[PDB]
């Protein structure tokens, strides 16, 4: 059993009991969230192709933690023009655990 959900502008293929990192969500740790924006759900040999959203299908999950990704370094250099800039970046994420799929 797997499904396709939408979160953080991106789409994810999701099966029950799977950990993944999505964009930061405005939810504390430990609570429960519902994804009503479900594009496809499959259960073995029965696949419900989702016209834009499957009717009534939803996915349950809980927040595990928040954090930041590894640092990336930005360097802007223009040769023999006496210019240089530097910057760093760490992107926020949220890790969720899937604990329910039903169409």
């Amino acid at each position: 059993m797997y499904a396709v959900i939408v979160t953080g502008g991106k789409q994810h293929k999701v099966t029950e009991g799977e950990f993944l990192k999505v964009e930061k969500l405005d939810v504390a740790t430990g609570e429960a969230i519902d994804f009503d924006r479900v594009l496809l759900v499959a259960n073995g040999e029965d696949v419900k192709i989702g016209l834009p959203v499957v009717e009534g299908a939803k996915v349950t999950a809980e927040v595990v933690s928040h954090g930041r990704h590894d640092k990336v370094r930005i360097i802007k250099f223009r040769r023999r023009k006496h210019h240089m800039k530097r910057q760093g970046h760490r992107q926020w994420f949220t890790e969720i655990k899937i604990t329910g799929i039903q169409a």
Partner: protein, 117 residues
């Protein structure tokens, strides 16, 4: 008050030479050559964060194209049908179903043909 540069100059060279680890020859052990390699490696890293998004989309398209023709449809006729019916699944998820969930990809393809496109 006379200031001696020996101690802060050494820490500044060592930061550059640590980033140049794994490079070839003088690019990993002399500061002058290693500084340019570290700057150039940061230009490529900035630029290839953009190409990475282009190169993966071209890879997903080439694989939906191969998967659609096994079902009797070209890539461009599939996308026209998918937009026509309602379906709005990504190219990243479509390319994943083409390889692994071939029976789910078949249902989506024959849904796009049934849209008379």
């Amino acid at each position: 008050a006379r200031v001696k540069r020996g101690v802060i100059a050494r820490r500044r060279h060592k930061k550059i030479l640590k980033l140049a680890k794994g490079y070839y020859g003088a690019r990993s052990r002399v500061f002058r050559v290693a500084k340019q390699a570290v700057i150039k490696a940061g230009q490529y890293a900035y630029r290839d964060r953009r190409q990475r998004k282009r190169q993966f989309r071209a890879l997903w398209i080439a694989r939906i194209n191969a998967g659609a023709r096994q079902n009797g449809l070209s890539y461009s006729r599939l996308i026209a049908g998918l937009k026509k019916a309602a379906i709005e699944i990504d190219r990243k998820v479509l390319a994943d179903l083409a390889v692994n969930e071939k029976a789910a990809f078949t249902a989506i393809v024959e849904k796009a043909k049934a849209s008379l496109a």
